[PDB]
């Protein structure tokens, strides 16, 4: 395996280094506003060296944005596709590329057989070419790599089945900045080329000047270069026609033949297109070829890409005609006039890349190597697109919840073949497709109209319900004696209990386990562990009595803690935010121990009095002017006091100190160690009163954040043997620090209410000497080194925090792990901050035509890990990556893939079993089975199961960490007949594996395997 820590890769362009060197001056470059006046030598091209030009027609189709998916389909996309089919069929030389398979699949499914065959023919003959072939063109900032892969696989699996094609070129013209997670996944999915567009205008200028817009994009840790993917960055401000023909949009706009008037479009530069005629074709060609030759100056080969399209283009037959006929007249003239030395034609994206590499192999070009990312994007001036790292955070959190439910449903149901009547495949396809759709660059990004956000939410809720159904049917089958198992495939044998979604104070959604002498003495519950190692985790359930005890399914007592159910209320009479306790419902908490990829059953039993193995938390309400807080049968009376500093320790874990406002002030790791200053603070950013306004996309703060005025908040302290917590009702946030013996969990119930033009940030202040360095993750896959740059505005220093961030010095590290993607930064040495929500009155002139005023309460979840790192083997100062410790990685897993909890619905579970998966291998902590998916329906003689295995890289810090078993996924199911290494989409077999043994992957690597079973 490659060493991902100790070898700094040697690349021609390293983005962090480039950022350090660049001046980012925003000067008027002339007609190319953000470039310079391009000059070319007319003698560069001649009879023996022509410029080959590929004009590639396209239509960007958003699967929801200002209309819903279905609205756009009915109003626009179905017409675009119908007319593409007609026009390509009738015009053999015309070409078209298509990206969004969600739309194509819908369209194709609805076609009659005659037209299906016509469609297959224009694909087979190369006129219509699929680019990327994902369900959507995903966001690259907020999306988790697992969901990027999910959506890619959904689109490509459809394409292989129905169109018999698998794209090897990717087209990403629209995401708001670009992540190296894309080439990582694409290169491991058979791709050979990719194209990107939305990168900072200063980066475009810098790379264009050096002819570094085409590069071999490798991962930041990759010393050898085996991850490299050829990447083409487009040079100009937009992917529209005015910004794709060459540097002067006043000229290029004249070659968008939809802009002459009858279509309701015009040219901003006030010179319209004119129909090409015999009397103007020479002058028109002069102008166009001059633009092309200028654009060609920015690249290294004699092969030029000219995209021809825009959003929802090619809708009407007349538009197809007007573009095609005019371009054909230009081609006929240009190609026949030797003096131009140009050969121009309609082409596809693959045709462009094939020609580029032909030129490369002929020895006419060598390409630079590059590592890094392309965040944070700015399209002009100081307009940095860091707002969408946070916009609509409820749905960003929902994404991560659904991500896990899809994984768990696919895994739990994979163990068996299911009858068609069970509707397992149907429900899983629904769930995968809704989650995939949300990866769209107007979905998870929070940049859609309110009614479209509501549509995505409804789709995701349906998907969650589908997952639940599949999960609970699977648990019932896995844990019931086979000769007793009698499934009704519509029945709910278990209900899922989720303690963090939608969350306390967001929705009262969980079911109370109702026990009583005169109703039901006991209840079975089951935990699932999707991770491939034994896991212990505290779990909680609501119960109708505090006198409940827990046993395992050997009837062994399990230590438990009972706590009250606390709900916070904004009291509109007293004008205070204060907690109320239930007098009929209680929380029972205990440690569940669950096999790798397995299930464990426990029993909750009522008694008339305090059980031997159950303890009760104390509760202390700190406020001036307290009133009584009765708790029914709960055996411990609530205590009251004036606000004061408090200190808590659970188990042998850290000791946490809190201010009188209930906010963390210090962490003491051990009994003898220092009280390390770690302060939580809430602040607010505002909006500018002049100039450009923040909106769904842009973050344009009116200076540094100002502290939120806290007043005298009510603080609730719960102290238990297993779990303790401090909660405080702040303006807009109920902030909760939870201690279970390791790194604390932080929960924020964020309700920005009616606070207009406000962004609420949570900041951590420490004395860690981090300087200008911090680390943030990319798509939950890797941690990249960031440098705060004072030459850039505050909003430019904001990055996506899709799963975590950290700061460190020689001795100490503070890591904040997240359960939802949000924006964040380190704006000063020793600080971390992460945006919670934003409510914005104005539009930011990027097309949405609304602000963000549809905020709703959301429960954000985090883990906070303070660690000593003086003993850790870390990358050198010049290495662009960082790596988590074991504790931080496990903390991230606790947020993203918690235990699943099931409550048996009926009174008695006949044939119940105690455990599933006790014999599953417990793999090394850095290895995950990211995907387990049965690929075949029940009628297949040879069953196939697909696995995606990911190994992260954790720092070596002196912990021996011994005794784990080799995980061979190909032997997880019995009767294996073959094992193949495949592309990550499972669509191509790459290696036939000897002994039918799937070898474990290297650090930072991801591999897919398919086992076949007789
Ligand atoms: C529907 C419609 O007809 N809209 C027109 C607006 O487009 C137009 O406003 C201008 O929008 C340009 C961007 O348009 C493209 O993006 C739209 C947004 O959707 C896509 O992006 C969003 C993110 O932004 C993303 O979420 C989503 O998924 C999607 O991918 C899209 O709707 C547009 O397409 C529609 O309209 C065009 C015609 O306009 C049709 O051809 C399409 O088929 C479709 O109906 C486009 O794809 C912005 O670039 C414009 O800003 C420039 O211009 C204004 C002046 O108007 C300046 O103030 C700005 O500074 C900016 O100037 C540019 O600056 C750079 C850098 O200096 C220069 O290099 C460049 O040359 C400058 N351009 C100009 C013109 O000076 C603008 O906001 C308005 C036109 O007034 O009319 C409609 O509302
Ligand atoms: C599918 O494509 C493969 C290779 O691209 C080809 O060999 C095969 O004939 C095709 N099958 C059809 C026509 O469905
Ligand atoms: Zn778009």
Curated annotation (Swiss-Prot):
**What residues does Zn(2+) bind to?**
60, 62, 174, 441
- Where's it found, cell-wise? Golgi apparatus membrane
The Gene Ontology terms for molecular function here are:
alpha-mannosidase activity; carbohydrate binding; mannosidase activity; mannosyl-oligosaccharide 1,3-1,6-alpha-mannosidase activity; metal ion binding
Pathway info: Protein modification; protein glycosylation
Q: Please tell me whether the keyword Metal-binding is annotated for this protein.
A: yes
A Pfam family of the record is Alpha-mann_mid
The record's cofactor note says: Binds 1 zinc ion per subunit.
Q: What induces it?
A: Inhibited by swainsonine and by copper sulfate.
What's the protein called, per UniProt?
Alpha-mannosidase 2
Q: What organism, scientifically named, is this protein from?
A: Drosophila melanogaster (Fruit fly)
């Amino acid at each position: 395996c490659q060493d991902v820590v100790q070898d700094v890769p040697n690349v021609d362009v390293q983005m962090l280094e480039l950022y350090d060197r660049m001046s980012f001056k925003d000067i008027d470059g002339g007609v190319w506003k953000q470039g310079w006046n391009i000059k070319y030598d007319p003698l560069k091209y001649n009879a023996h060296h022509k410029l080959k030009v590929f004009v590639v027609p396209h239509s960007h189709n958003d699967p929801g944005w200002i209309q819903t998916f279905e609205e756009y389909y009915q109003h626009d996309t179905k017409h675009i596709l119908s007319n593409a089919l007609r026009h390509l069929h009738d015009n053999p030389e015309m070409k078209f590329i298509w990206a969004e398979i969600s739309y194509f699949a819908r369209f194709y499914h609805d076609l009659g057989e005659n037209k299906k065959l016509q469609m297959k023919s224009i694909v087979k003959n190369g006129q219509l070419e699929f680019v990327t072939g994902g369900w959507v063109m995903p966001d690259e900032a907020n999306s988790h790599w697992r969901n990027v892969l999910l959506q890619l696989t959904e689109g490509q699996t459809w394409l292989k089945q129905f169109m018999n094609v698998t794209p090897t070129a990717s087209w990403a013209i629209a995401p708001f900045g670009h992540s190296p997670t894309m080439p990582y996944i694409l290169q491991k999915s058979g791709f050979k080329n990719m194209l990107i567009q939305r990168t900072h205008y200063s980066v475009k200028k810098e790379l264009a000047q050096q002819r570094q817009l085409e590069f071999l994009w490798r991962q930041i840790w990759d010393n050898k270069g085996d991850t490299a993917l050829f990447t083409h960055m487009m040079p100009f401000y937009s992917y529209d026609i005015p910004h794709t023909c060459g540097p002067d949009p006043k000229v290029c706009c004249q070659f968008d033949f939809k802009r002459m008037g009858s279509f309701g479009l015009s040219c901003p530069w006030k010179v319209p297109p004119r129909t090409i005629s015999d009397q103007n074709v020479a002058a028109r060609s002069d102008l166009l070829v001059d633009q092309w030759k200028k654009k060609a100056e920015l690249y290294r080969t004699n092969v030029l890409l000219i995209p021809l399209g825009d959003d929802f283009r090619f809708k009407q037959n007349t538009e197809w005609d007007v573009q095609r006929v005019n371009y054909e007249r230009l081609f006929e003239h240009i190609n026949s006039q030797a003096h131009f030395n140009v050969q121009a034609q309609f082409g596809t994206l693959q045709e462009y890349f094939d020609a580029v590499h032909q030129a490369e192999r002929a020895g006419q070009a060598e390409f630079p190597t590059l590592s890094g990312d392309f965040f944070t994007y700015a399209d002009r001036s100081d307009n940095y697109w860091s707002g969408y790292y946070t916009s609509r955070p409820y749905h960003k959190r929902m994404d991560r919840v659904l991500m896990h439910y899809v994984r768990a449903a696919e895994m739990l149901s994979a163990w068996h073949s299911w009858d068609g009547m069970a509707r397992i495949e149907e429900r899983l396809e629904q769930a995968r497709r809704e989650l995939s759709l949300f990866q769209h660059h107007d979905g998870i990004t929070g940049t859609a109209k309110t009614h479209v956000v509501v549509d995505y939410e409804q789709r995701m809720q349906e998907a969650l319900k589908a997952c639940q159904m599949v999960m609970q049917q699977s648990v019932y089958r896995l844990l019931t004696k086979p000769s007793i198992y009698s499934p009704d495939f519509s029945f709910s044998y278990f209900t899922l209990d989720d303690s963090r979604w939608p969350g306390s104070g967001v929705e009262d959604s969980r079911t109370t386990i109702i026990l009583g002498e005169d109703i039901l003495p006991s209840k079975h519950v089951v935990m699932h562990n999707t991770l491939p190692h034994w896991r212990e985790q505290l779990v909680d359930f609501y119960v109708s009595s505090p006198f409940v005890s827990v046993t395992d399914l050997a009837n062994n007592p399990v230590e438990a803690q009972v706590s009250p159910v606390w709900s916070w209320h904004h009291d509109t009479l007293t004008k205070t935010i204060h907690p109320q306790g239930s007098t009929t419902k209680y929380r029972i908490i205990f440690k569940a121990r669950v096999p790798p990829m397995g299930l464990a059953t426990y029993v909750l039993t009522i008694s008339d009095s305090k059980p031997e193995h159950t303890s009760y938390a104390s509760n202390l309400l700190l406020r001036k002017n307290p009133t009584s807080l009765p708790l029914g049968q709960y055996p411990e009376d609530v205590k009251f006091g004036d606000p004061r500093e408090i200190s808590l320790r659970v188990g042998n874990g850290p000791t946490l100190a809190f201010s009188e406002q209930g906010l963390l002030k210090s962490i003491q790791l051990t009994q003898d160690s220092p009280h390390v200053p770690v302060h939580f603070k809430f602040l607010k950013y505002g909006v500018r009163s002049h100039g450009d306004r923040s909106g769904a996309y842009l973050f344009l703060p009116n200076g540094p954040a100002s502290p939120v005025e806290l007043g005298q908040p009510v603080v609730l302290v719960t102290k238990g043997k297993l779990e303790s917590s401090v909660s405080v009702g702040l303006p807009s946030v109920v902030h909760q620090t939870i201690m279970r013996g390791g790194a604390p969990e932080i929960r924020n119930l964020v309700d920005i209410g009616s606070l207009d033009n406000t962004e609420i940030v949570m900041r951590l202040e420490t004395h860690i000497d981090s300087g200008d360095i911090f680390y943030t993750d990319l798509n939950g896959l890797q941690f990249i080194k960031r440098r705060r740059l004072d030459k850039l505005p505050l909003q430019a220093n904001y990055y996506p925090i899709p799963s975590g961030m950290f700061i460190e010095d020689a001795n100490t590290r503070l890591t904040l792990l997240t359960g939802q993607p949000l924006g964040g930064s380190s704006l000063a040495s020793g600080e971390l901050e992460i945006m919670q929500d934003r409510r914005l009155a104005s539009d930011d002139e990027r097309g949405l035509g609304q602000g963000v005023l549809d905020n709703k309460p959301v429960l954000h979840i985090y883990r906070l890990v303070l660690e000593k790192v003086n003993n850790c083997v870390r990358p050198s100062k010049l290495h662009p990556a960082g790596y988590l410790t074991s504790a931080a990685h496990k903390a991230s897993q606790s947020l993203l893939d918690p235990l699943d909890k099931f409550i048996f619905a009926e009174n008695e579970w006949i044939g119940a079993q105690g455990q599933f998966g006790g014999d599953h291998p417990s793999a090394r902590e850095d290895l995950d089975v990211s995907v387990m998916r049965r690929l075949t329906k029940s009628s297949a003689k040879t069953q196939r199961v697909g696995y995606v295995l990911h190994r992260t890289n954790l720092m070596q810090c002196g912990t021996p960490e011994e005794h784990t078993q080799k995980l061979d996924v190909c032997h997880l199911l019995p009767n294996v007949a073959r094992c193949e290494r495949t592309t990550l989409t499972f669509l191509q077999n790459l290696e036939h594996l000897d002994g039918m043994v799937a070898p474990e992957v290297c650090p930072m690597e991801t591999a897919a395997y398919v086992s076949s079973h007789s």
